[PDB]
Amino acid sequence: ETLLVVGAGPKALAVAAKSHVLRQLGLSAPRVIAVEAHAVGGNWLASGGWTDGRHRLGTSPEKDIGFPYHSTWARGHNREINEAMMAFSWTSFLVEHGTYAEWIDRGRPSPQHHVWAKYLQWVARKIDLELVLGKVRTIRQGWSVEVAGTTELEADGLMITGPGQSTKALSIAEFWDLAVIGETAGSALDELVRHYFENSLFSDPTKWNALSIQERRDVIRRTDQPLWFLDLFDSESADLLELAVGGPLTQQRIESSIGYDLAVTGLGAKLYLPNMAALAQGPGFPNLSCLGELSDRVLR
Amino acid sequence: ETLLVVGAGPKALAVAAKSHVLRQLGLSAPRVIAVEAHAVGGNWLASGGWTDGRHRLGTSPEKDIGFPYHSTWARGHNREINEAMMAFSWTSFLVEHGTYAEWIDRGRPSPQHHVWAKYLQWVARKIDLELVLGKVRTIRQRGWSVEVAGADGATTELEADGLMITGPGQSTKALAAHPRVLSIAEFWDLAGKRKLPISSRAAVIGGGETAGSALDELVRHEMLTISVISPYFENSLFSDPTKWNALSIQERRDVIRRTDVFSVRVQESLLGDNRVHHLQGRVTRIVGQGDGVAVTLDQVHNFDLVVDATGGQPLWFLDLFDSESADLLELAVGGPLTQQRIESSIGYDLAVTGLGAKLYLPNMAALAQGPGFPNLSCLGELSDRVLRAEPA
Ligand SMILES: Cc1cc2nc3c(=O)[nH]c(=O)nc-3n(C[C@H](O)[C@H](O)[C@H](O)COP(=O)(O)OP(=O)(O)OC[C@H]3O[C@@H](n4cnc5c(N)ncnc54)[C@H](O)[C@@H]3O)c2cc1C
Ligand SMILES: Cc1cc2nc3c(=O)[nH]c(=O)nc-3n(C[C@H](O)[C@H](O)[C@H](O)COP(=O)(O)OP(=O)(O)OC[C@H]3O[C@@H](n4cnc5c(N)ncnc54)[C@H](O)[C@@H]3O)c2cc1C
């Protein structure tokens, strides 16, 4: 009945929103709480350090919080959840702001990172996101999260989102105040020269486990600081994570551990790591390719 | 309280869904009946004679039944209506069918007309459109009573308070009676049969989607030549006419004229065909000339075959009115029934100003209200104008 999320980004909002509709439809769903160091949609803003905010989303903005508003496998009230959910869509956003015609008339431009933010923030308003402003300091098991506002929050499930800190590698974060490695790569390479089947799986990965591990890894390869989050775990809880995983915390190990609901599910408590559910469950889960199956996974 | 619509296509659905929304949502609206001679969305099917049904819609399909879900002016339960209305969108249609991931993933391909008919049809199922299957034959004041003839041979008279005309004419109607002048429908029939005379000096009149589709069919036949005859801020005026009145008649007239050319896809297939040439000017005169047909623009051209893909004859509807109602409109409109005169009469609710009963003529509304009303560019504003506007 209570699910904590590190970061208030697309995934956080994706999970929250789906929870908002489920319970509001007579169905059960976790109460959803995001802890967020900076702001809803923070990593899409200039002050987030990962981008200037000016470069454009590199996937179609329709691929949003509820996309693709469909399940190959789900149970119960599918028609009505989808419908409810489209209320929080990109198109729904444009139409509340009365700019939907402008969008269409301009040729559907891909939005700036900073407007994608406005979107996220808007979804937060729309579902009255239960939001804790603060920085997750440490995590431990049932989970208890130390948030520096310094205080603790107990929750039953836990989701980690974000690619980490734009400051920790210059660092990309430093790079936007003023030999380059790695989309993010795509952008900053940009501002330096001056100074159907594969795609289906990203949005629909329910045929994922019917092609070789060699094949999947290839889809993940060519797709283009992943373990940053380990730091948040005390030794005690990282230990407990080393166990379920069945060895030291690399990602041959972490990735393969990750179950159908995006949770490891070798522990006494659920830890959701969608950013590492590419190889196991579907290559879109790490990003914006299918936020709606992601939400579907952790709540249904 | 009751609104009769000639034809069940985008505009009928635009208005009837907005009706259905509003009635279910407390607010008042008329029961909306649509009389349709063929099928819901029939003019987007091959069987409607206007298209082979396989060509693609040239406007973004997001410009649908409720677009753009926003009024500068209309107030009332707006969020609840836009939210209700988006249920009937292209997007929703794709989502209810599971195909939305594929649509996005394929690059948002524009739908084939016949898929756009499936959309229209789906919306009809979804709003439980009150549909009457027959041809409107006669319209007449006294509200309106309209004669509808079923295929069963029966003929009944529906009555209504208000009436909207939709549709662009008849596909079987060339602009000139001559067997070498072909209505668009005869074209599809003959194209389909490969019975278009080999090595003809063919002409296609028209400059829009109807002409675009047919040029694209006709390049597939062994024609000798194929001559084509036609005469952001802008774009925005199609979706949002609110600032249309802040423009002169030569300004407003020159947006409506650019409204005519062709698809980027079709453009290529024509750009890269040595037989296809473009001819400028206006068809002042068509007359048979023995073996061929002679078309005047002056300049005279002869052709072994002419295809009328103008996309409609806009006063076609007048042929439905009886003398009484025609005169009655001639009086309201202030002179004889020319295009110009009838356009000049269109009010803000899209109806003829100063007429005893309500006659909604969206297709005539470009000049006076906005250039999107005739087409798929602002169906949601249209529905508003005919249902939610109050004074004048
Ligand atoms: C510039 C950029 C562009 C991208 N473009 C796309 C794209 O176009 N399409 C696509 O599919 N994917 C793309 N990606 C991949 C992308 O990272 C994921 O799609 C995206 O991160 C999903 O957001 P999220 O919810 O996982 O985390 P984010 O939205 O990045 O949110 C993480 C949040 O956590 C907060 N935070 C950080 N540390 C802490 C802490 N210790 N405690 C509490 N809060 C914290 C931050 O302020 C931030 O708000 C892009 C990535 C970047 C960096
Ligand atoms: C092939 C084609 C392509 C077009 N492409 C576009 C486009 O891509 N984008 C755009 O904005 N606009 C385009 N247009 C302009 C187009 O006509 C309008 O945009 C669109 O027609 C809206 O249709 P409607 O509701 O007015 O009527 P329609 O969709 O034509 O339907 C009218 C209905 O009337 C029925 N009918 C005819 N006579 C009678 C009668 N006596 N009684 C009862 N029913 C009758 C027909 O069966 C038909 O179903 C196109 C037009 C054509 C012909």
TrEMBL record, chain A:
Enzyme Commission (EC) number: 1.14.13.59
Biochemical pathway: Siderophore biosynthesis; mycobactin biosynthesis
Domain of life assignment: Bacteria
A GO molecular-function descriptor: L-lysine 6-monooxygenase (NADPH) activity
This protein's record includes keyword Nucleotide-binding: yes
Catalysed reactions listed for this entry: L-lysine + NADPH + O2 = N(6)-hydroxy-L-lysine + NADP(+) + H2O
Keywords from the UniProt entry: FAD, Flavoprotein, Monooxygenase, NADP, Nucleotide-binding, Oxidoreductase
Binding of FAD, residues: K11, E36, N43, W44, G58, T59, V136, G162, Q165, L288
Cofactor: FAD
Family listed: Belongs to the lysine N(6)-hydroxylase/L-ornithine N(5)-oxygenase family.
Protein name: L-lysine N6-monooxygenase MbtG
Originating organism: Nocardia farcinica (strain IFM 10152)
